Structure 1
Amino acid sequence: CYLSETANLGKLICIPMALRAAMELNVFQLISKFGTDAKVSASEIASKMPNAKNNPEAAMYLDRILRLLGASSILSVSTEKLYGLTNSSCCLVPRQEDGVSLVEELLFTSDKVVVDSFFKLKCVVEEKDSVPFEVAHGAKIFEYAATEPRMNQVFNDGMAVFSIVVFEAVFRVYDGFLDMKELLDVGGGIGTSVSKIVAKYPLIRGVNFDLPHVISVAPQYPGVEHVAGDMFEEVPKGQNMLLKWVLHDWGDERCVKLLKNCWNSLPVGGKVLIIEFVLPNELGNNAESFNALIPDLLLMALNPGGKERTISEYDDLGKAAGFIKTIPIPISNGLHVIEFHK
């Protein structure tokens, strides 16, 4: 049965690298500009690639990429074959309104800096206190970002664009921003998250807090103030705080130190909102499971102590930091807002 399983196992590396090429060639957007329901040939797609205009062989090469994605349910195939979008590939078309899609976050998670870290993944099992990213690059990820402007941009934009589709889901379910007057986004990246909160809740004075190397490249957003610092040393005073995709980067002791910094900088009656994909109690072949397992594997490779957590585990961190009423609010497919009250 070797030669049945050669297909099942040997496709695993090929599919993501074919997807990355298709994203870099803007294939999904090019299909969409014929119409979202269009079914178009490799040569019709290539005709919209100015870089391919002197390459007679472009379409045949492109067809070889696309037919693999068609066999892998990323594109529809119909009888030169014609390719169309699927539910998955519609999420790779920059929206006509604002350019948002999953492309930036998927370009980050399959970036060479990440894949080179995954090549050292076995180190975390064999060697005490080793970090695959460190073994691969000779510095930790946030130190690396400070010296590597390309990686800094890919990572920051991955987080920022992904943040937009996350907050659209949050705002459909969660109303806890109403009546806030000030929000501090702790480890807020380039400030996109707090920009979207202020757009929905125009009375909030938004403050975005991150490392110098991130704040110095952040765009100016209406109703957002940027502040640079180090959240483990101290956090600015704020009436309310957000920690999105921060606690999952760090081990328990670092999380408790950060959360105690937050507690000291909140007023009586203030809250910190944790937004994370929560690890469910039973894992299976479903979105809730993979939405947690994907960043669980990435953080195991990328940063010391990083991991995904259950509701009980987030509650234990907040209680160790002095917070007293944990309120977990499911949003979508494992994404939660977890309120910690001071």
Structure 2
Amino acid sequence: VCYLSETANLGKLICIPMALRAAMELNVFQLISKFGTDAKVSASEIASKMPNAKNNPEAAMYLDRILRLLGASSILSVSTTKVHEKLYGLTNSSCCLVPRQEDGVSLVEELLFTSDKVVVDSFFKLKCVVEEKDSVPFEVAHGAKIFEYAATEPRMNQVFNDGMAVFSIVVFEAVFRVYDGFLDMKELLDVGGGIGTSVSKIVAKYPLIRGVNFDLPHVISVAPQYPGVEHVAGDMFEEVPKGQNMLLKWVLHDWGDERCVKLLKNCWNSLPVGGKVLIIEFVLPNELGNNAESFNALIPDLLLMALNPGGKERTISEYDDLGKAAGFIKTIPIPISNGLHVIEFHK
């Protein structure tokens, strides 16, 4: 029990992420690549390619103090050239924050959500979800309910959307590459489909696809016109349209076990025998490593527990436990990437 290591070892748990979130906020990773592939610059250099830092002499040293920490975290590479300066360079998990040449996707939007003040405020009240009966960290921490806050609070809406959005562009691109069980299907229906996007994209790698979008009236009300897509409003708990194969990306984790039955029922009772409710979650591995498949589950099981804790991420066991108790012959799960599955529930 060496306290003065257990310090620097637990003391950094809070620092690393808020140092990171400042690099992002200051668009460091971008400005670094606007210098070349496998490159290396001083904070002095990066504080020059920064607009709001004109007329703050300390800009360069203060920045060097942040980057040193990321550079020590591995979240950045670092090297010193001959009067000796610290020069900075990108990494694997650090290029994943350079916005792409074409479409602009990055984890920036995803990571600014996770590390967002609204969220952390909500984390700071986790304690409660154990202690109090039904308490919601989010609710305990803020005026009232999440949809209430988010209505009356534009920038919280921006960040929760922009995150789940870039993170979809990425969660999907690798649904493509692996899974190809989209072509012995002509018709597909997105239950809790959002405003299409999911299908919009699908019915464009598979143009021979009857793209249907099912969500709440107020959602589809806003929802734009994708060629491929026909939209449908309802309450998937009361009844789901008819369709061949159906799609449930990030619906089942928002919902309890009983409410996951009642949905999957209505999903079957409107599926032709031969079609399948496709389920796209991050799956909770049964033994939990430092394994990314283990953090890709745990991270959201937390965010759920903080903002909507009636939610839950599940083991592949726990998902066929559902597929079955609805009434589904198969339950044939396809590993995709680092914990992202397509559990298939067959009727």
CA, structure 1 residues 167+295, in 2 after alignment: closer, same or farther (shift >3 Å)? same
Query: What is the alpha-carbon root mean square deviation over aligned residues?
Result: 2.1
Structure 1 position 261, deviation (Å): 2.6
Unmatched segments (≥5 aa) in structure 1: none
* Contact 1:160–1:193 (8 Å) recurs in 2: no
Q: Give the Cα separation in 2 of the matches to 1:334 and 1:205.
A: 29
Equivalent residue of 2:190, what SS?
strand
CA distance in 2, matches of 1:147, 1:194: 30
Per the alignment, in what secondary structure is the counterpart of residue 306 of structure 2?
Answer: helix
Is the contact made by 1:41 and 1:83 (CA closer than 8 Å) also made in structure 2? yes
Q: Does the aligned pair in 2 maintain the 1:235–1:261 contact within 8 Å?
A: yes
Measured after TM superposition, the shift of residue 2 of structure 1 is 2.3
Q: How much has 1:46 moved relative to structure 2?
A: 2.0
Bigger CA drift: 192-201 or 86-95?
A: 192-201
TM-score (norm. length: structure 1): 0.92
Residue 211 of structure 2 aligns to a residue whose secondary structure is: strand
Question: What is the CA-CA distance between 1:183 and the residue it aligns to?
Answer: 2.2
Q: Which moved more, 1:205-214 or 1:10-19?
A: 205-214
* Rounded Cα–Cα distance in structure 2 between residues aligned with 1:186 and 1:303: 20
| Residues 123 and 130 in structure 1, CA contact (< 8 A), matched pair in contact too | yes
Over residues 32-76 of structure 1, what are the superposed CA-to-partner deviations in whole Å (9 max), with x where a residue is unaligned? 121231111112222222222232222222212211111100010
CA contact (8 A) 1:194 1:207 kept: yes
Paired position in structure 2 for 1:313:
318
* Structure number with bigger Rg: 2
> Counterpart in 1 of 2:294?
289
SS at match of 1:11: coil
Structure 2 CA distance for partners of 1:225 and 1:17, relative to 1, 3 Å: farther
Q: In 1, distance between residues paired with 2:167 and 2:130?
A: 30
Q: Contact 1:250/1:303 (CA < 8 Å) preserved in 2?
A: no
Distance 1:189 1:173 in 2: 23
CA distance 1:49–1:205, shift in 2 (3 Å): farther
- The structure-2 alpha-carbon separation of the partners of 1:69 and 1:217, relative to structure 1 and needing over 3 Å to count, comes to farther
Task: State which drifts further: 210-219 or 20-29.
Answer: 210-219
TM-score (norm 2): 0.91
Higher helix share: 1
* Shift of residue 337, structure 1, vs aligned partner: 0.3
Q: In the alignment, is the contact (CA less than 8 A) between 1:183 and 1:207 conserved in 2?
A: yes
Aligned residue for 1:292, secondary structure, equals: helix
* Larger mean Cα displacement after TM superposition, 230-239 or 304-313: 230-239
Rounded Cα–Cα distance in structure 1 between residues aligned with 2:150 and 2:230:
22
1:15 is matched with 16
SS of 2:78's partner is: strand
Residue by residue over 1:197-232, the C-alpha shift from the partner in whole angstroms, topping out at 9 and shown as x without a partner, is: 122111223233344565455555443344454433
Deviation (angstroms), 1:193:
2.2
Query: Does structure 2 retain, via aligned residues, the 8 Å contact 1:140–1:303?
Result: no
Partners of 1:156 and 1:190 within 8 A in 2: no
Alignment partners' CA distance in 2, 1:130 and 1:308:
19
Deviations 1:223-272 (A, max 9, x none): 33444544334333333221112211221112112222322333333211
CA shift in 2, pair 1:199/1:281, >3 Å: same
Q: Relative to structure 2, which stretch is displaced further, 190-199 or 142-151?
A: 142-151
Could you tell me whether the CA contact under 8 Å between 1:182 and 1:204 is conserved in 2? yes
Deviates more, 1:216-225 or 1:31-40: 216-225
% identical aligned pairs: 100
Deviation at 1:96, TM superposition (A): 0.8
Find the counterpart in structure 2 of residue 113 from structure 1: 118
- How far apart, in 2, do the equivalents of 1:305 and 1:261 lie? 21
Say whether 1:143 aligns with 2:148: yes
Q: How many angstroms apart in 1 are the aligned matches of 2:30 and 2:235?
A: 39
Per the TM alignment, residue 95 of structure 1 is displaced from its structure 2 partner at its CA by: 0.9
Larger displacement relative to structure 2 (21-30 or 65-74): 21-30
For 2:306 and 2:297, the matched residues in 1 are separated by 15
Which range moves more in the overlay, 280-289 or 201-210?
201-210
| 1:33 paired to 2:34 | yes
CA 1:321–1:100 in structure 2 vs 1: closer, same or farther (change >3 Å)?
A: same
